[PDB]
A paper describes a structure:
We demonstrate that DarT is an enzyme that specifically modifies thymidines on single-stranded DNA in a sequence-specific manner by a nucleotide-type modification called ADP-ribosylation. The [name] macrodomain adopts a typical macrodomain fold composed of a six-stranded mixed β sheet sandwiched between four α helices and one 310-helical element.
To get a better understanding of the antitoxin function, we determined the high-resolution X-ray crystal structures of the Taq and Mtb [name] macrodomains (TaqDarG-macro and MtbDarG-macro) in a ligand-free or ADPr-bound form. Importantly, we confirmed that the Mtb [name] proteins exhibit DNA ADP-ribosyltransferase and hydrolase activities toward the same substrates as the Taq proteins. Moreover, the genetic screens in Mtb indicate that the macrodomain ortholog (Rv0060) is an essential gene in this organism, whereas the toxin component (Rv0059) is dispensable (Griffin et al., 2011, Sassetti et al., 2003).
Author numbering: -1 to 150
The structure:
Amino acid sequence: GGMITYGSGDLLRADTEALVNTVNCVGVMGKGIALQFKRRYPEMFTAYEKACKRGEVTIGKMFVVDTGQLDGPKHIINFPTKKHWRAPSKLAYIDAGLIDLIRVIRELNIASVAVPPLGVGNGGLDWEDVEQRLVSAFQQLPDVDAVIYPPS
Ligand SMILES: [Cl-]
């Protein structure tokens, strides 16, 4: 059925139905993988920025956008790993987000997703901690292919 695999190279070139991006709640995708997502999906960013100004993006809730692309990823799942970008990430934010990430994958019937190392580096979390949680979460989706990208 579904496999959890070790990703490498550029997450944005993953051959999956969804891509996960790591975001803050204040409307700024200024460095790291979020910057790359902004450059590739400018309409997605504009929607995210509007939602942030209105207070609609919060810890524990995915902000999901459709790409509308005939080829490649259909959904961008923006996973909040931080409140303000000034502040670090926390394991509790990852726990809460994963709950909604699973819910969203089920609800949208996503067959495959690529996931970055949520809150590691930029957010200051330990990889091994986050990797455990990611693997645990995707074991609840036995028919989904999950490609997990370690710190690069
Ligand atoms: Cl499943």
